[PDB]
Design a protein around this ligand. Structure first.
Ligand SMILES: Nc1nc2c(ncn2[C@@H]2O[C@@H]3COP(=O)(O)O[C@H]4[C@@H](O)[C@H](n5cnc6c(=O)[nH]c(N)nc65)O[C@@H]4COP(=O)(O)O[C@H]3[C@H]2O)c(=O)[nH]1
Ligand SMILES: Nc1nc2c(ncn2[C@@H]2O[C@@H]3COP(=O)(O)O[C@H]4[C@@H](O)[C@H](n5cnc6c(=O)[nH]c(N)nc65)O[C@@H]4COP(=O)(O)O[C@H]3[C@H]2O)c(=O)[nH]1
Ligand SMILES: Nc1ncnc2c1ncn2[C@@H]1O[C@H](COP(=O)(O)OP(=O)(O)OP(=O)(O)O)[C@@H](O)[C@H]1O
Ligand SMILES: Nc1ncnc2c1ncn2[C@@H]1O[C@H](COP(=O)(O)OP(=O)(O)OP(=O)(O)O)[C@@H](O)[C@H]1O
Ligand SMILES: [Mg+2]
Ligand SMILES: [Mg+2]
Lengths: 40, 247, 229, 87, 240, 240, 29
């Protein structure tokens, strides 16, 4: 989706920061101790 | 509504859901208290909607004859025309509350203390408004020497509220409410892993009121020190392993 | 339209703590809950920090189903006592309660894509004097890109972002004309503030619109331009 | 993708959609019966989201599905995978 | 006394089942010792052991230290003996150390004769290693783990299980025609298939992520009840 | 080219994926020769090979015969090199024969120089054997089959993948929270993950029962389409 | 292993299961 939008135009330097994905990843690391231990 | 105007017309009820047992029973009581004994009230199960206790409740409410779902339509009509020429000669009490209360006199599920278990069983057996020799079954199980008795207690997961369990004297004592002797094995399979007999060496079964009362009297003469408690409750955040030397 | 600017989005700072706060406004008067539910669901899905985005539903009908939906999904909900000045007055009244640094307005039929604020707010964080940014709701698209060259891109009534302090300084959205958007853009331009235009599709939701809408807009716009002049 | 109770998974293309549900065109032959609860898998970027639906109308290879009462996060995922697209 | 759980196929869930069974046994009042014989050493992570904890009986034996000091105690009735992390070079050349773990058999025999451990579970791999065969020889009872699918059905007719190994089913799906056919065929054909099967439950998929046994992680799950039933059956049958 | 498929864990779906990939490549017009190297020898049955058929390259070399004689003509664009059945004593004593199977490597190099087959697929097991390492080295490209579960995530950070190996995800389930969490983690913690995923399709479960590749069994399933997409990606990338 | 394949085809469900999947039929012979 984001890649398609960036292909329809130039958008070469706008690095996408998915807030939803980051929040879900943070919640997952908070909930599952093994993932938290291995990630950091 | 049409029945409250009719005086003797046959009333055949078709039941499909268990939630409609109590209100339908109440309505049958109303009909039996308004239209006299000449009316013919019948109950027709469709797929699975009735138990033995509920069937007895419907019979006491004023139903002339209950037609189980097992019988086909032809046999249903055959019985319907069989009941022709009969009057309701039984007595129906004014209060429906007592009849509803007879459906479940224990209203307590799970493991209970030995004194509490004996008191509850005796109180149920001392209720005059219950069928004779049909209130339930008391069974004592003797565990195989492979396992102890508390583990056997942890094995069982009864599902109905009327089932009560306890541990005493190296024996598992179970009271099942409103259970016949014939279908005891079905109840055990419902409240145990299937291979019963591979989990106990022998059993003693009582289904008569006098026998159950005598067994209760005998059980009341036991030492409190042999009364068990649930293993998970006594045994019972993250647990960090503490290093140690195996010796 | 001699020279379309073809403006492109400025990347936001990689520090998410330096990003601004945005208040999304979805004003409705008689639209059914089915139309507004999609817009609100899309708004909650916009990729932006949750503590820096507040969604407001502005229902003029006082409908209880909208309040139930707002309570269920957590978005805020404000209904006015009176109904003067229509959408412009509704947004002006709602502005007295919002506290964000930027005010975004979306129509009920428009579906905001999740990459809206990410592609928009960079210019606000970069160019201080920029007070308004417009996104497309063909001919209109290119007249608005050409206007951006001369700083004449005007509010189109929806899918826009307005800086809060300049908006409150000019006395809020103008209410003296049928086209409040154009008058607001003109007032912003008069005080020296700048306007931009980004030609990146949102989700465009409604299809065709037919000439029925084409004439609605064509007329409400001519009358507003005459009044503004 | 459409997943049956039997575990069969079939690729499909969505013809039209609305809040009431989606009508899709199924590639290949599939004997999907109406009233059967199926799972619709939608692709969002590199992720897959599963939505439980019930088939309410079948017109040959065209199959119409209706959404069972959805949750908030499921609703947001649906609106992201259907309306808030890259179009 | 000794209950070795080995997988007919990799990925059937031998380690999680072993942890759940050990927890169920310790929940019934029995002293439990778990020994991870798998070279990959994934059993420790199921008992809240730090991933950097390099200690293990095999590691101590290879380094020349005393494996008895590598024991970890989880609870009063549950002790753990993880295998120990192995270096990449050791994994690439298992033959250089496969014959260096002979004394663990004597140690386990001494532990069994001690009587402090009423049950000594062993998580065994499937690699046909000499140490694996020695552990099978010292194991009183065995449980071969299979899944209801074509692969395990094929395996059951050509590979030889250890003598006395009952068959246990894990990851049993609901609503799969081929699975139902294979289950009925096994019911009417496999004499050693256990009466208990464990349905696919997300509790088993989340126990390892939560670094806890499924019994401690979620006791109300169907998997926990099935594992407890299996534990009671093992107590009844394998005790002698 | 030469592509070797190996699984990071037993039972991840490496053999079925290899067979489906071989069928998908051959149905696109590419001559494919697929070799079974896992001692379990379960690749034959996916191509309507009788169980009593004990002919295989390993057994051919163990009996002093020619390994090339063990080949089977499945289709004009797919040939198979069955591993061959091993006796119980041989299975329990791999060391007595695992060092005597090296002759196949140079023969495979000769086959690579033959040019008859445009693709050489190899079923690479994970027994950590010398033959496995030699075959992996001989492979031009390596595909590691993983599942989105706790065990595979643990293994990927404590076991070494083949140099340049790309990761393929098999058994991607529906409605699993831990699966979604681990996949989101892998989307950024790993750079070798392919953009295509293989779902949990009943067709993949029934293909082994029908003794047919999943595409041949039923080409309308999504798993077959995903295998075809993987084959297209290999053609576009693993050509050289 | 302990395999008792005798007197298996006497069940309709088992016969259907063997017929549907060639692998099961091949093994059961
Ligand atoms: N006290 C007790 N007895 C048990 C229990 N499980 C089975 N039984 C006994 O087994 C008889 C037959 O049950 P069924 O074959 O499942 O056939 C049952 C079943 O299909 C249905 N039924 C009754 N109550 C329930 C219920 O709570 N749930 C469900 N799902 N079906 C029920 O009605 C049929 C006849 O039930 P009944 O006439 O009561 O007769 C019941 C009852 O006496 C239990 O947990 N406690
Ligand atoms: N097959 C079978 N299963 C049995 C039987 N007796 C009990 N069960 C099982 O036990 C569960 C708990 O029933 P409950 O505690 O009596 O609690 C019951 C009970 O209070 C009520 N109920 C359901 N059907 C009847 C009925 O026919 N008569 C009455 N009086 N109550 C009913 O609904 C509750 C929920 O029951 P369920 O959701 O169905 O779930 C039932 C069912 O799965 C039996 O005879 N046969
Ligand atoms: N019944 C089950 N339901 C769901 N997931 C399960 C079940 N049993 C096991 N699993 C999952 O399957 C994976 C494999 O299980 P486990 O970690 O025990 O592997 P294993 O069989 O010991 O394999 P290996 O020896 O190769 O490591 C784990 O992610 C586990 O959570
Ligand atoms: N995507 C899939 N969906 C469903 N079932 C699958 C899938 N992939 C493989 N399977 C099934 O999983 C089982 C094991 O797969 P397979 O034998 O290919 O794995 P493996 O890693 O080679 O295992 P092993 O060599 O340990 O036997 C088979 O019954 C197969 O049909
Ligand atoms: Mg393991
Ligand atoms: Mg294989």
């Amino acid at each position: 989706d984001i890649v398609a939008l960036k292909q329809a135009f130039s958008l070469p330097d706008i690095d996408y920061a998915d807030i939803s994905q980051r929040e879900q990843l943070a919640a997952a690391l908070k909930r599952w101790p093994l993932l938290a231990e291995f990630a950091q | 509504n049409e029945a409250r105007t009719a005086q003797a017309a046959t009333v055949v009820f078709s039941l499909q859901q268990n939630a409609q047992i109590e209100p339908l029973a109440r309505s049958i009581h109303t009909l039996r208290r308004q239209r006299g004994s000449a009316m013919k009230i019948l109950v027709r199960e469709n797929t699975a909607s009735l138990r033995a206790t509920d069937e007895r409740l419907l019979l006491a409410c004023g139903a002339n004859m209950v037609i189980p779902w097992n019988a086909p339509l032809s046999r249903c009509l055959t019985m319907i025309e069989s009941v022709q020429g009969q009057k309701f000669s039984r007595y129906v009490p004014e209060d429906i509350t007592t009849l509803l209360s007879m459906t479940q006199p224990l209203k307590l599920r799970g493991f209970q203390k030995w004194d509490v278990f004996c008191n509850a069983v005796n109180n149920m057996m001392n209720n005059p408004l219950l069928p004779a020799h049909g209130k339930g079954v008391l069974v004592a199980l003797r565990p195989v020497p492979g396992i102890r008795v508390e583990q056997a207690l942890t094995l069982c997961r009864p599902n109905r509220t009327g089932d009560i369990m306890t541990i005493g004297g190296n024996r598992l004592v179970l009271f099942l409410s409103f259970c016949r002797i014939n279908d005891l094995d079905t109840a055990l399979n419902h409240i145990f892993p299937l291979p019963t007999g591979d989990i106990f060496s022998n059993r003693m079964v009582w289904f008569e009121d006098d026998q159950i009362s005598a067994e209760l009297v005998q059980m009341r003469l036991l030492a409190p020190e042999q009364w068990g408690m649930p293993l998970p409750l006594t045994q019972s955040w993250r647990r960090i392993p503490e290093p140690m030397r195996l010796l | 339209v001699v020279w379309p600017l073809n403006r492109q989005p400025v990347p936001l700072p990689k520090d998410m703590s330096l990003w601004p706060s945005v208040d999304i406004f979805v004003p409705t008067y008689n639209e059914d809950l089915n139309v507004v539910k999609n817009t609100i669901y899309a708004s909650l899905g916009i990729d932006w920090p949750k503590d820096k985005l507040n969604i407001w539903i502005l229902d003029d009908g006082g409908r209880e189903e909208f309040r139930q939906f707002a309570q269920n999904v957590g978005v805020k909900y404000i209904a006015r006592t009176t109904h003067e000045h229509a959408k412009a007055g509704n947004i002006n009244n709602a502005l007295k309660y919002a506290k964000g640094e930027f005010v975004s307005i979306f129509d009920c039929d428009h579906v905001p894509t999740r990459s809206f604020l990410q592609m928009t707010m960079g210019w606000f964080l970069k160019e201080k004097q920029l007070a308004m940014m417009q996104t497309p709701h063909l001919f209109y698209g290119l007249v608005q890109d050409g206007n951006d060259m001369w700083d004449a891109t005007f509010f189109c009534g929806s899918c826009a972002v307005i800086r809060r302090k300049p908006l409150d300084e000019i006395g809020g959205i103008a209410v003296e004309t049928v086209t409040e958007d154009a008058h607001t853009s003109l007032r912003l331009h008069r005080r020296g503030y700048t306007s931009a235009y980004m030609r990146i599709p949102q989700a465009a939701g409604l299809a065709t619109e037919s000439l029925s809408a084409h004439i609605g807009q064509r007329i409400r716009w001519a009358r507003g331009m005459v009044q503004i002049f | 993708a459409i997943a049956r109770e039997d575990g069969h998974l079939f690729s499909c293309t969505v013809q039209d959609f609305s809040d009431g549900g989606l009508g899709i065109k199924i590639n290949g032959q599939a004997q999907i019966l109406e009233g059967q609860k199926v799972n619709l898998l939608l692709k969002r970027g590199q992720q897959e989201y599963v939505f439980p639906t019930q088939v309410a109308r079948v017109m040959g290879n065209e199959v119409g599905l209706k959404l069972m009462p959805l949750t908030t996060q499921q609703h947001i995922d649906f609106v992201q995978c259907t309306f808030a697209r890259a179009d | 006394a000794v209950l070795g759980l080995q997988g007919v196929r990799g990925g059937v869930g031998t380690t999680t089942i072993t942890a759940a069974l050990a927890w169920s046994l310790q929940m019934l009042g029995e002293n439990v010792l778990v020994v991870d014989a798998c070279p990959d050493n994934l059993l420790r992570l199921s008992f809240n052991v730090d991933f950097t904890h390099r200690q293990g009986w095999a590691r101590a034996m290879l380094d020349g230290q005393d494996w008895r000091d590598a024991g970890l105690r989880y609870t009063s009735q549950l002790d753990l003996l993880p295998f120990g992390q192995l270096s990449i070079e050791e994994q690439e050349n298992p033959q250089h150390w496969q014959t260096r773990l002979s004394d663990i058999c004597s140690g386990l025999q001494q532990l069994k004769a001690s009587g402090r451990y009423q049950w000594i579970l062993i998580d065994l791999p499937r690699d046909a290693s000499q140490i694996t065969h020695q552990l099978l020889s010292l194991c009183d009872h065995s449980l071969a783990i299979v899944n209801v699918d074509a692969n395990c059905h094929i395996r059951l007719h050509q590979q030889a299980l250890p003598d006395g190994a009952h068959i246990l089913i894990n990851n049993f799906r609901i609503g799969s025609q081929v699975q139902d056919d294979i289950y009925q065929l096994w019911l009417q054909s496999q004499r050693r298939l256990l009466p208990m099967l464990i349905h696919r439950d997300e509790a088993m998929a989340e126990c390892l992520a939560a670094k806890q046994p499924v019994g401690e992680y979620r006791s109300d799950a169907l998997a926990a009840e099935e594992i407890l039933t299996l534990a009671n059956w093992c107590l009844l049958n394998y005790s002698g």
